[PDB]
């Protein structure tokens, strides 16, 4: 490609014994028999050998006639695979395996003293992919810059994690929940009221999952 | 002719015969063929505008032969008649006279041809394909209509009642 | 009056055989189907709540729309919706069929699933998770047993309803 | 660089009427030629292509089109020459591109052929190339190319009695139409849209 | 919800310790709270029963047994209300030990000491699922909305307000009718002097 | 983005300023300022007046008036839109709209008998600001 | 789930089905789209006879 | 995760409804994998033209890989032996659907199809097509002699075994195996608090032995103490990255 | 050279026959037993 190779073959190991990192047991004359095979002429294409034999004969019988299929596959199937333990997960009292970076419903969070963290910058609106994010902003008395609209169609968005890999504040983030099945199309127009209340309830956990990730490049 | 419209592809009579004895006959005219179409070749192309409006022509005559068997199957007959729906279509292709490019018009006609196909095989919807044969200044003859707008507006021109009637929402 | 006496109690064990098994249709469309099929395989398993997936609409009870609606699925999506037997519930899966999703901006996709047909749940996710698909039809289970009795009729001064 | 490289030359010495203008770029792989091809000779130079020893063992693996009619360089717009092939984006109506792959040479080859007509006309290689088939109705239908001597013409992805080509830049991603159910029916039927914007 | 304690299941020591210590209504519906599996009710283990690692705000137990056959089922809760079966659905854990129970981590609240979780002035207490309940969240224009007009008045008037018209009788100059001006701000150079 | 290194390597405390109050047209971020004196020539040499200066000396020194003092005049504004960093900044236009959320349209000014050539950004039914435009036969470069 | 530790089934899924409501399409012969079906049930009632549980029994 | 989805959807076709639960439950673990760097299961959006989240990988997840590919084998053993030797399964897929290579390439068939019809082709194996430091391992490519649907199935299957070699083989590539010995009596000095007594993966020990300085600028310097890296970010989730005028084709 | 003998990218080398011989077949088909031996039995 972009460098040299004056050999391209690539020779094979050492297979002398006195060598150090000589592999013994590798070849196992029971197992590797592929020497009394390899010279069939069924595994090149479509031809038949010269001279057919007693032994084919004998198999074709054992498998016309015995029919082998639904004894075989039937016990080694049912009995072995039935002996197993179960794999299910009892959901409304267990739960599947999650990570501190699972991305579920969106929040918007505070400074501990109860402040707003977003500051109106609109990263997070140019960052959707969806367009799902829609951002009005007005000086707050106060003078702080802060939103008078901060809304997210939930039925628009992707649940990327685009827009809280964008704020610089952390204040819109995914939180861990998942249960937000909703029977109105309209309970799914999220505005700011419900994404602050969704930061005030999930709040400890956020902030956990969100404390490793931080002392992760620590 | 191995095509779909080919004097072979007709629909026997019987189980045991494709029409009566001593003959062989079939209808692939007026209504669908037996066999589903697998290709729709090119048209030939059309060096003038002769070659042009001959296919539109041809075009507009099988349409017109296609109307009953849509109709029918497609269950407008009493939104109108079939000489109504080919006067709106007509109405369509007189609106796209002023073409003189033989090369768009072979387009056209290919796609024309595929629609129709559409049509008479209930790949589209009727209230879909019915687009192509409303009328354009009458009401549809399977229901009533308001004649408000002509009482009130009696002999204003178009700017009046266009006026009149706004262009946008008034409550914002 | 003393029909009720007869009709109240019937209608619980109407509901519950009804909740009991809830047969959704063999349909999917897009990516939210492979996580459907996820959801039904034996790690969630929804024949534990008696669900259990049928291929023709005449013996299903529940539409599981779970992928992208385009202009020229509508009709489709119509029809199948009119050919299943009453009573039916329908349940939207992930962002193309709740809304627009990914595809809101697009010439040839339906912006909503329930601009064709009436919608009785939504799953938000994109895709949601076989943890919230299967949060989302226990939901509608309890929903539609409770959906028989919710206190419609008045009671006289017997006690008993109308 | 660093690897076996030949033009594809040859093709230029049977066709000897023809111009020959060929680039090779680091930003595709070291064994991919891109050439430009008149439309009138589309055919004729994939017949050859199709038979010829040393080409004959090819496959086609990519067709579409480009709409240069609004291309512009957006930026460093003083670092342009008379070699760059986005020289030849300009004043071009319209664009057609076509990636090959040939095992014997083990060798990518795309080639250009530019449509300054306004009804687009080309004629097809599907007959030649059992792939042009679906890649050219979608081509056609996308950017409103009228092939020529095709094997099939119908719609490939668009909706059913619909005219339009949605890839051309005029054309906004909303399109025109909405899909509604209309209970006045008691079916799906289209109508003007109006729509959110961001 | 008979035989919430098979027969096999009982005889064994551990159900015993179980009706011993925690009582007979407590024991029996323990079956109903959980209904993972016959032989799983109070742990995998015959000796004694596992102790739970912690409780609910809403009263519901939390459960970690290492003894289980496949590993996903290490962690479990058994729900106060378990009125029907299909009742209890998953929206009903609170937040740390919603990522207790989905092994997020291995943290979990505690009532008293020291916590690994942020108690802050401003935290609201975990709800579950409020749709199809009067609670459901509702946009401020939707026509659910009693005070939708506030929302689309203020909208409207963002980038058109309309002019109040004079209504009722007013005091006429001729033609002109007199009114007193709408200004918030002072004309202070009518005043100042 | 374009030229520079693309990483820093400043890891002290950096200087800090006192914002000014110029009147309610101007707002005044002046830690962001880079010392570059267009506002003081555009003051001194196209509005005509002489209350912007450069006070202090070395990294210490301030851009501005020494002392409380508006800056009330015409053509205010216009210095903002020469000054290239968020120093000062179009006070009614404040955390309103970002640049890529705007459409611009080209049109002439009526509130002077000058038809001043202006820029008007819009964000759907909403005008969010006004900016001049260049005609040099009108206004120049500059608008009331 | 169905009962405890799902013991009715069978019970839940035959009650559901006699809940579901049938319709016929047009096109089809109403008649025979309902009568196939009882002469199906009535035959299938029947194979209970041919049964043998011990020595003429 | 593609050729089990694939395999078990096939038998399900074809008539085997078991198989499917097995390979659903084996590519719930993949989907675990992806949910460990990224929080999602299916739409990772990991990918990035020049950036790595680095964080994301640590080496408790390779050892879960591992771990995975040894049951993995047993898995696939399983969907083995209901399937390849089965007499219906063989009359089902024999000779069904053949095709050579003249059709292989009049119809541009790639990938598992095209190595059935007989032909040579894979893009990693490829002098000037590989990516992604596939030259420079060594696992082995399968071929038909039939182009029908058992050589394409039992191609899948062989595709399977060998993308677990590949991976044992890049987490040996990230790998730590020798020790410091003591000088006297060859005997291991293990660590007691390093981070490296836990296992022998180390994700980050080429990346850092190489592109030192890139390494220690990256793991210093971030968005909330820097200004060139703060406009970085701005102007990178405001307008994005800008890419200079340009023709590319680039296939996997 | 990870896929073949005596690779030094191997790292399980040493004496492993016990291991070796508990995860593998240690038995190799022979064709035709079970066919006469079965046809033979069903005769008789
Ligand atoms: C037949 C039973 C039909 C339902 C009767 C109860 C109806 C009721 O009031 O339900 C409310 C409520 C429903 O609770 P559930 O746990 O969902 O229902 C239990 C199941 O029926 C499961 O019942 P269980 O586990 O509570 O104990 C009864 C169980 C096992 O019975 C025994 O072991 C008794 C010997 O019986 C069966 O398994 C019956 C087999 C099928 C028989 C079909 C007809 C012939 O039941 C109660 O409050 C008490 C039920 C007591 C049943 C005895
Ligand atoms: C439930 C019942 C089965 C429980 C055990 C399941 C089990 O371990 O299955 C695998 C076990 C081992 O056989 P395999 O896995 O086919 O061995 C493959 C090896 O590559 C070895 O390949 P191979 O073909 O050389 O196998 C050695 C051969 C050993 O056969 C001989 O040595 C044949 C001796 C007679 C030769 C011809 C002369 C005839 C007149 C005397 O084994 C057989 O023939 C297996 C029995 C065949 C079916 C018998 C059904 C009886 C009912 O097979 C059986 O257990 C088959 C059923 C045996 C029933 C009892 C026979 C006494
Ligand atoms: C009852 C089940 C009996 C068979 C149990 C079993 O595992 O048989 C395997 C054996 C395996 O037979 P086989 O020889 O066909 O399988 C080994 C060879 N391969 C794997 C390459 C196909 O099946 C039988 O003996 C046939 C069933 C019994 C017939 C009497
Ligand atoms: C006709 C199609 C080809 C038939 C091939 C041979 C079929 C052999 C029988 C298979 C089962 C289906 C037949 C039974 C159901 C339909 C009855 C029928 O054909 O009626 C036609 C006859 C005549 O049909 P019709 O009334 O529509 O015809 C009117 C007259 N012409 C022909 C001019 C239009 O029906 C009647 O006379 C009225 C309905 C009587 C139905 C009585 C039986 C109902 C089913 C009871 C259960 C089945 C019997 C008991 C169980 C079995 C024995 C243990
Ligand atoms: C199976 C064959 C078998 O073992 O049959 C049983 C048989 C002994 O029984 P039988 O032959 O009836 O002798 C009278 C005592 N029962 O067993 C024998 O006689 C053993 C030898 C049987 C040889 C023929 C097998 C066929
Ligand atoms: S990205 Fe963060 S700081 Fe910016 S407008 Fe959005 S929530 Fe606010
Ligand atoms: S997760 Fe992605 S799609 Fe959803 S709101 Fe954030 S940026 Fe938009
Ligand atoms: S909502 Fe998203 S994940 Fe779901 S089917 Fe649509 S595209 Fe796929
Ligand atoms: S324009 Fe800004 S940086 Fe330049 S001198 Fe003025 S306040 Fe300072
Ligand atoms: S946007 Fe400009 S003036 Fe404002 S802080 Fe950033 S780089 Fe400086």
Redesign the pocket.
């Known amino acids: 490609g972009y460098i040299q190779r004056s050999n391209i073959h690539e020779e094979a190991p050492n297979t002398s014994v006195e060598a150090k990192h000589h592999n013994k047991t590798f070849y196992d004359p029971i197992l590797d028999i592929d020497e009394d095979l390899k010279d069939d002429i069924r595994l090149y294409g479509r031809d038949k050998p010269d001279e057919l034999d007693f032994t084919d004969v004998w198999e074709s019988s054992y498998q016309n006639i015995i029919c082998p299929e639904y004894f075989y596959h039937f016990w080694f199937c049912g009995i072995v695979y039935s002996f197993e333990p179960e794999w299910t997960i009892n959901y409304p009292f267990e739960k599947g395996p999650l990570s501190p970076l699972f991305r579920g419903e969106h929040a918007l969070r505070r400074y501990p003293t109860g402040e707003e963290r977003c500051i109106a910058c609109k990263l997070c609106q140019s960052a959707c992919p969806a367009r799902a994010i829609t951002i009005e902003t007005e000086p707050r008395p106060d003078g702080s810059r802060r939103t008078v609209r901060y809304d997210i169609d939930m039925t628009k968005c992707i649940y990327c994690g685009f827009c809280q890999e964008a704020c610089p504040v952390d204040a819109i983030v995914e939180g861990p929940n998942y249960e937000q099945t909703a029977y109105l199309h309209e309970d799914l127009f999220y505005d700011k009221y419900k994404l602050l209340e969704n930061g005030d309830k999930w709040e400890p956990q956020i902030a956990r999952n969100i404390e490793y990730l931080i002392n992760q490049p620590l | 002719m191995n095509h779909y419209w080919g004097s072979s592809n007709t629909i026997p009579a019987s189980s045991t015969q494709n029409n009566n004895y001593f003959s062989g006959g079939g209808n692939n005219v007026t209504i669908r063929g037996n066999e589903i179409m697998e290709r729709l070749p090119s048209q030939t192309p059309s060096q003038n505008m002769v070659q042009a409006s001959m296919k539109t022509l041809r075009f507009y005559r099988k349409f017109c032969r296609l109307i009953p068997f849509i109709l029918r199957i497609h269950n407008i007959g009493t939104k109108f008649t079939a000489q109504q729906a080919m006067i709106n279509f007509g109405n369509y292709i007189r609106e796209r006279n002023h073409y003189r490019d033989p090369g768009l018009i072979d387009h056209r006609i290919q796609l024309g041809y595929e629609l129709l196909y559409e049509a008479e095989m209930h790949f589209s919807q009727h209230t879909i394909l019915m687009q192509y044969l409303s009328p354009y200044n009458t009401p549809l003859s399977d229901r009533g209509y308001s004649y408000l707008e002509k009482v009130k507006y009696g002999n204003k021109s178009k700017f009046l009642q266009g006026f009149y009637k706004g262009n946008k929402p008034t409550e914002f | 009056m003393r029909v009720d006496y007869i009709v109240t109690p019937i209608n619980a064990v109407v509901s519950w055989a009804r909740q009991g098994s809830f047969w959704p249709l063999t349909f999917g469309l897009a990516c939210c189907a492979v996580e459907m099929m996820h959801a039904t395989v034996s790690r969630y398993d929804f024949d534990r709540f008696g669900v259990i997936f049928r291929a023709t609409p005449r013996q299903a009870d529940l539409i599981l729309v779970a992928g992208t609606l385009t202009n020229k699925m509508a009709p489709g999506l119509r029809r199948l919706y009119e050919q299943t037997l009453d009573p039916k519930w329908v349940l939207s899966m992930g962002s193309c069929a709740n809304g627009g999703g990914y595809y809101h901006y697009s010439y040839s996709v339906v912006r909503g699933c329930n601009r064709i047909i009436p919608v009785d749940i939504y799953v938000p996710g994109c895709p949601p998770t076989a943890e919230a698909l299967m949060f989302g039809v226990l939901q509608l289970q309890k929903s539609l047993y409770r959906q028989i009795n919710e206190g419609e009729k008045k009671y006289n001064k017997k006690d008993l309803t109308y | 660089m660093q690897n076996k490289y030949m033009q594809p030359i040859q093709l230029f010495i049977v066709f000897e009427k023809l111009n020959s203008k060929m680039w090779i770029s680091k930003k595709l792989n070291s064994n991919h030629s891109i050439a430009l091809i008149p439309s009138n000779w589309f055919y004729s130079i994939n017949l050859f292509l199709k038979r010829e020893l040393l080409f004959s063992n090819i496959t086609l693996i990519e067709n579409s089109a480009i709409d240069t009619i609004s291309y512009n360089l957006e930026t460093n717009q003083n670092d342009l020459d008379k070699t760059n092939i986005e020289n030849y984006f300009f004043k071009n109506k319209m664009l057609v591109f076509y990636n090959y792959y040939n095992y014997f040479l083990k060798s990518k080859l795309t080639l250009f052929i530019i449509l300054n007509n306004l009804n687009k006309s080309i004629d097809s290689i599907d007959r030649i190339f059992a792939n042009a088939n679906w890649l050219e109705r979608e081509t056609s239908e996308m950017y409103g190319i009228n092939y020529k001597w095709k094997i099939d013409t119908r719609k490939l992805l668009l909706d059913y009695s619909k005219i339009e080509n949605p890839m051309l830049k005029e054309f906004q991603s909303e399109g025109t139409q909405d899909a509604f159910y209309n209970i006045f029916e008691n079916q799906v039927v289209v109508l003007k849209n109006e729509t959110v914007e961001l | 919800?008979?035989?919430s304690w098979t027969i096999n299941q009982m005889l064994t020591p551990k159900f015993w310790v179980h009706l011993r210590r925690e009582g007979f209504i407590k024991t029996w519906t323990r079956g109903?709270k959980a209904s993972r599996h016959a032989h799983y009710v109070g742990g995998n283990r015959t000796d004694g029963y596992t102790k739970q690692v912690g409780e609910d705000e809403f009263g519901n137990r939390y459960y970690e047994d290492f003894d289980v056959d496949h590993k996903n089922q290490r962690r479990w809760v058994e729900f106060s209300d378990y009125f029907?079966?299909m009742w209890s659905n998953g929206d009903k854990v609170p937040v740390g030990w919603h990522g207790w129970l989905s092994h997020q981590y291995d943290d979990f609240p505690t009532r008293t000491g020291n916590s690994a979780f942020v108690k802050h002035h401003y935290l609201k207490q975990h709800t579950a699922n409020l749709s199809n309940t009067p609670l459901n969240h509702v946009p401020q224009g939707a026509p659910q909305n009693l005070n939708r007009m506030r929302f689309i008045t203020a909208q409207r008037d963002r980038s058109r307000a309309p002019w109040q018209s004079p209504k009722g009788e007013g005091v006429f100059q001729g033609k002109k009718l007199i009114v007193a001006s709408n200004s918030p701000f002072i004309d202070d150079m009518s005043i100042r002097d | 983005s374009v030229y520079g290194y693309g990483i820093s390597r400043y890891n002290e405390y950096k200087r800090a300023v006192e914002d000014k109050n110029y009147g309610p047209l101007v707002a005044t971020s002046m830690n962001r300022c880079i010392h570059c004196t267009r506002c003081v020539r555009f003051a001194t040499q196209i509005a005509g007046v002489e209350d912007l200066g450069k006070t202090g000396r070395g990294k210490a020194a301030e851009i501005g008036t020494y002392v409380e003092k508006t800056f009330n005049t015409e053509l205010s504004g216009n210095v903002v839109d020469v000054c290239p960093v968020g120093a000062l900044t179009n006070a009614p236009y404040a955390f309103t709209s970002r640049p890529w959320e705007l459409k611009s349209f080209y049109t002439s000014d009526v509130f002077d008998t000058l038809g001043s050539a202006i820029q008007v950004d819009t964000r759907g039914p909403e005008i969010m600001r006004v900016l001049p435009r260049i005609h040099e036969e009108i206004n120049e470069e500059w608008i009331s | 789930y169905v009962?405890?530790?799902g013991?009715?089934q069978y019970?839940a899924d035959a009650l559901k089905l006699f809940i579901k409501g049938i319709v016929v399409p047009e096109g089809s012969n109403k008649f025979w789209f309902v009568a196939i079906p009882s002469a199906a049930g009535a035959i299938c009632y029947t194979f209970w006879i041919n049964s043998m549980w011990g020595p003429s029994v | 995760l593609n050729h089990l989805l694939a395999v078990a959807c096939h038998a399900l076709d074809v008539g085997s409804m078991s198989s499917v639960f097995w390979a659903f439950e084996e590519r719930e673990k993949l989907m675990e994998f992806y949910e460990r760097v990224c929080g999602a299961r299916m739409h990772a959006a990991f990918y990035r033209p020049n950036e790595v989240n680095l964080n994301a990988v640590s080496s408790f997840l390779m050892e879960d890989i591992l771990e995975f590919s040894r049951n993995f084998f047993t898995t696939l053993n399983e969907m083995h032996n209901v399937l390849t030797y089965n007499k219906i399964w063989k009359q089902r897929l024999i000779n069904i659907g053949t095709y050579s290579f003249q059709t292989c390439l009049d119809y541009g068939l790639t990938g598992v199809m095209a190595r059935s019809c007989g032909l040579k082709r894979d893009l990693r194996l490829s002098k000037t097509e590989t990516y992604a430091n596939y030259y420079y391992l060594n696992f082995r490519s399968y071929t038909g002699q039939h182009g029908d649907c058992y050589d394409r199935f039992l191609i899948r299957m062989n595709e399977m075994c060998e993308s677990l070699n590949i991976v044992n083989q890049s987490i040996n590539k990230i790998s730590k195996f020798n020790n410091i010995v003591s000088i006297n009596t060859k005997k291991n000095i293990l660590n007691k608090e390093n981070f490296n007594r836990q296992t022998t993966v180390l994700p980050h020990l080429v990346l850092s032995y190489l592109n030192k300085n890139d390494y220690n600028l990256k793991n210093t310097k971030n968005d909330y103490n820097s200004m060139e890296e703060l406009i970085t970010h701005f102007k990178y989730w405001s307008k994005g990255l800008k890419v200079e005028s340009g023709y590319t084709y680039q296939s996997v | 050279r990870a896929d073949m003998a005596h690779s030094p990218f191997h790292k399980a080398i040493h004496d492993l026959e016990d291991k070796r011989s508990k995860l593998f077949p240690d038995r190799r088909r022979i064709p035709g037993r079970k066919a006469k031996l079965l046809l033979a039995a069903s005769l008789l």
């Open positions: 919800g008979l035989w109903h029907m079966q | 009962g405890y530790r013991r009715l019970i």
